[PDB]
Amino acid sequence: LKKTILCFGEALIDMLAQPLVKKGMPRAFLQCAGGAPANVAVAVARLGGAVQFVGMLGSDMFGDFLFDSFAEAGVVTDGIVRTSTAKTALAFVALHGERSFSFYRPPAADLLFRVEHFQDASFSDALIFHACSNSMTDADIAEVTFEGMRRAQAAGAIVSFDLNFRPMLWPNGENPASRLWKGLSLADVVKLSSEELDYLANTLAADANAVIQQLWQGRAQLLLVTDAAGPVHWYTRTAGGEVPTFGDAFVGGMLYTFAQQFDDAAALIDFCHDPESIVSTLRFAAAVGALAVAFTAMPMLSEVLSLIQEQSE
Amino acid sequence: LKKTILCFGEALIDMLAQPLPRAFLQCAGGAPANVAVAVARLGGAVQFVGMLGSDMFGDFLFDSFAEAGVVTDGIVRTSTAKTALAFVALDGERSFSFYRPPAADLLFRVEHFQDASFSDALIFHACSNSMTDADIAEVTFEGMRRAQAAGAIVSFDLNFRPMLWPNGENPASRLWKGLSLADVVKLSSEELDYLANTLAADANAVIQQLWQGRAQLLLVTDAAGPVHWYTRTAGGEVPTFRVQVQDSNAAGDAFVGGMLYTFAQQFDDAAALIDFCHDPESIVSTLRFAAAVGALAVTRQGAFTAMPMLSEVLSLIQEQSE
Numbered sequence: 347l348k349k350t351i352l353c354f355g356e357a358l359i360d361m362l363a364q365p366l367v368k369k370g371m372p373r374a375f376l377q378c379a380g381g382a383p384a385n386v387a388v389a390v391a392r393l394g395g396a397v398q399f400v401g402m403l404g405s406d407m408f409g410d411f412l413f414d415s416f417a418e419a420g421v422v423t424d425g426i427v428r429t430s431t432a433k434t435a436l437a438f439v440a441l442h443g444e445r446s447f448s449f450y451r452p453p454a455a456d457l458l459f460r461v462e463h464f465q466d467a468s469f470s471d472a473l474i475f476h477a478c479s480n481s482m483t484d485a486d487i488a489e490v491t492f493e494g495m496r497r498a499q500a501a502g503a504i505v506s507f508d509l510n511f512r513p514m515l516w517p518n519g520e521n522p523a524s525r526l527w528k529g530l531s532l533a534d535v536v537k538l539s540s541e542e543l544d545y546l547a548n549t550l551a552a553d554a555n556a557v558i559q560q561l562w563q564g565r566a567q568l569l570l571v572t573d574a575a576g577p578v579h580w581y582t583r584t585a586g587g588e589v590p591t592f593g594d595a596f597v598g599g600m601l602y603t604f605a606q607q608f609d610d611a612a613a614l615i616d617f618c619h620d621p622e623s624i625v626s627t628l629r630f631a632a633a634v635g636a637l638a639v640a641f642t643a644m645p646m647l648s649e650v651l652s653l654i655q656e657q658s659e
Numbered sequence: 660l661k662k663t664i665l666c667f668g669e670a671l672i673d674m675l676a677q678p679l680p681r682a683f684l685q686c687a688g689g690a691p692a693n694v695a696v697a698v699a700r701l702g703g704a705v706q707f708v709g710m711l712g713s714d715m716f717g718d719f720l721f722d723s724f725a726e727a728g729v730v731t732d733g734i735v736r737t738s739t740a741k742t743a744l745a746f747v748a749l750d751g752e753r754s755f756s757f758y759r760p761p762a763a764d765l766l767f768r769v770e771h772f773q774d775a776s777f778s779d780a781l782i783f784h785a786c787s788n789s790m791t792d793a794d795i796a797e798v799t800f801e802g803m804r805r806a807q808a809a810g811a812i813v814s815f816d817l818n819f820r821p822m823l824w825p826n827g828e829n830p831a832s833r834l835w836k837g838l839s840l841a842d843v844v845k846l847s848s849e850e851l852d853y854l855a856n857t858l859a860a861d862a863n864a865v866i867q868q869l870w871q872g873r874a875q876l877l878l879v880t881d882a883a884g885p886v887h888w889y890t891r892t893a894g895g896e897v898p899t900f901r902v903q904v905q906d907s908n909a910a911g912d913a914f915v916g917g918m919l920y921t922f923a924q925q926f927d928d929a930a931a932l933i934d935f936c937h938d939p940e941s942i943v944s945t946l947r948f949a950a951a952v953g954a955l956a957v958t959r960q961g962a963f964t965a966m967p968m969l970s971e972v973l974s975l976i977q978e979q980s981e
């Protein structure tokens with residue numbers, strides 16, 4: 347319960363296949379820092395927010411790369427633990443028509459983070475605890491995530507859950523629904539894509555409304571549903587609407603702004619009862635989010651400034 | 660026709676880290692896989708037997724074998740595990756990071772062997788990397804015993820890579836068992852010492868132990884230094900060729916490739932190996948060719964891609980002869 351954003355989960359290497367300079371030459375793969383909560387933590391640090399990444403990294407070359415990446419971005423690293431038991435996970439993405447994937451996970455270093463690896467100081471100082479479903483791919487890591495979410499709540503931190511459901515990372519022939527819903531019931535703020543909304547609806551053999559109502563049965567106070575290129579839809583236990591604008595980028599902007607606006611977890615409640623604030627804050631989160639990506643700040647800079655001017659006038 | 664060379668074991672991807680978003684270059688690899696490609700490049704009948712993942716890397720290895728002329732009928736696939744990856748970088752020593760134990764090649768089982776492979780096989784070649792766990796090790800031993808009974812010469816290149824073995828476990832036992840089952844053994848100077856150490860003795864003790872098994876020929880290597888050969892009746896050393904190293908990767912496998920290739924071309928059957936081991940003139944002639952293949956490989960980058968054709972090997976021998 348303070349001002350720090352605690353991002354928990356997996357950090358891994360994205361290996362991007364490069365187009366063949368073709369013939370005789372071995373094809374190349376480019377190394378890039380990846381992991382859902384991992385990139386959000388980096389985005390927040392870049393925006394200037396106070397953030398810590400909590401998770402396990404392998405003691406290998408890649409683990410070192412990820413650790414350094416966090417340090418350079420300004421992400422606090424003392425919550426990070428290491429292991430030689432498993433290698434840092436790898437996410438290979440290549441191209442006959444589109445994207446092809448190959449994940450070296452499980453096993454993986456990030457899957458081995460255990461409850462004893464959490465430090466009480468991280469929770470006491472966290473204003474927000476953020477997680478994704480990738481740290482729920484096996485029974486052990488899932489429970490670890492759930493306990494982290496409960497500890498966060500108990501400590502007075504706002505619990506944020508960005509589903510980021512990636513089926514390919516889940517065990518063959520198993521149903522993720524159960525863990526996804528448990529995770530959803532422990533979050534104060536939930537972020538979903540329109541596709542995940544329909545997926546959840548199906549798991550219920552009902553509609554989007556049934557999902558939203560199910561959500562309100564747990565801890566959830568705010569639901570954000572992003573789209574293809576459409577507006578962001580927000581929902582609370584008392585209302586709903588859409589955010590006019592001019593995925594992950596958004597999440598970073600959102601956590602950064604929430605940390606800047608809320609003094610505590612109670613502030614979220616007042617926020618949810620104020621559609622005007624909701625709209626203004628999310629529109630801003632979306633805008634400032636682009637900055638986590640010399641450069642042009644236009645037309646956004648002018649758009650944001652003119653709005654504030656009109657509102658003050 | 661019983662002239663096929665059967666290379667059994669692992670086929671994996673070597674990911675070569677490039678100097679400074681860091682780039683990694685995809686290269687076909689694996690000890691027995693390298694040998695197979697070397698043999699195929701020379702024009703010999705060869706088949707790679709092992710399991711490849713049902714992933715992008717497995718497809719790359721399958722196609723690379725096919726393009727090189729390696730028969731693929733003995734390859735089996737699995738989606739249970741990914742194709743092994745061997746990351747090679749620096750830190751200024753050549754560092755290593757493997758994505759194995761968990762890997763496709765380790766899941767090959769006795770049931771995957773095909774009688775037709777052993778029926779046409781004149782030679783069965785294997786390495787210690789397919790001995791990194793109890794299950795795969797048993798499969799390798801069985802392949803070796805099956806080959807011998809089917810009338811194929813059993814070739815074993817130790818190719819000991821400690822990093823791939825489980826922590827705390829002593830690989831000595833398995834290594835010695837594989838060694839006792841081979842007709843032809845290839846070791847590095849270092850491996851000879853390692854083996855000498857496991858016996859608390861010297862190189863001679865190791866050699867005498869080998870003669871207690873099936874071994875009829877032992878080759879001990881080292882870089883540009885002459886390779887030494889030993890049979891139960893004599894020993895000698897063959898000078899190498901003088902070349903400019905560009906990439907020593909897969910040098911030893913190329914050497915093995917040239918040697919096995921020559922065995923298959925010259926031997927009518929497995930029994931011919933005995934007469935061969937009793938004829939130093941032939942041994943020196945054959946090892947010269949093998950040394951030539953190894954020399955031409957080290958001057959070319961990669962492994963699968965660094966293998967020479969027969970005309971090129973013979974040219975080097977012709978030129979650097981007189």
Ligand SMILES: Nc1ncnc2c1ncn2[C@@H]1O[C@H](COP(=O)(O)OP(=O)(O)OP(=O)(O)O)[C@@H](O)[C@H]1O
Nearest residue numbers: 880881882883899900909910911912914950953954
């Ligand atoms: N610098 C060199 N000059 C000439 N020939 C070489 C050189 N390096 C290797 N070779 C040839 O290749 C054979 C392969 O040998 P080396 O002793 O380096 O094998 P190794 O260390 O077992 O290989 P690997 O890296 O596959 O384990 C040599 O005996 C030799 O004939």
Ligand SMILES: [K+]
Nearest residue numbers: 906908961965
């Ligand atoms: K080479």
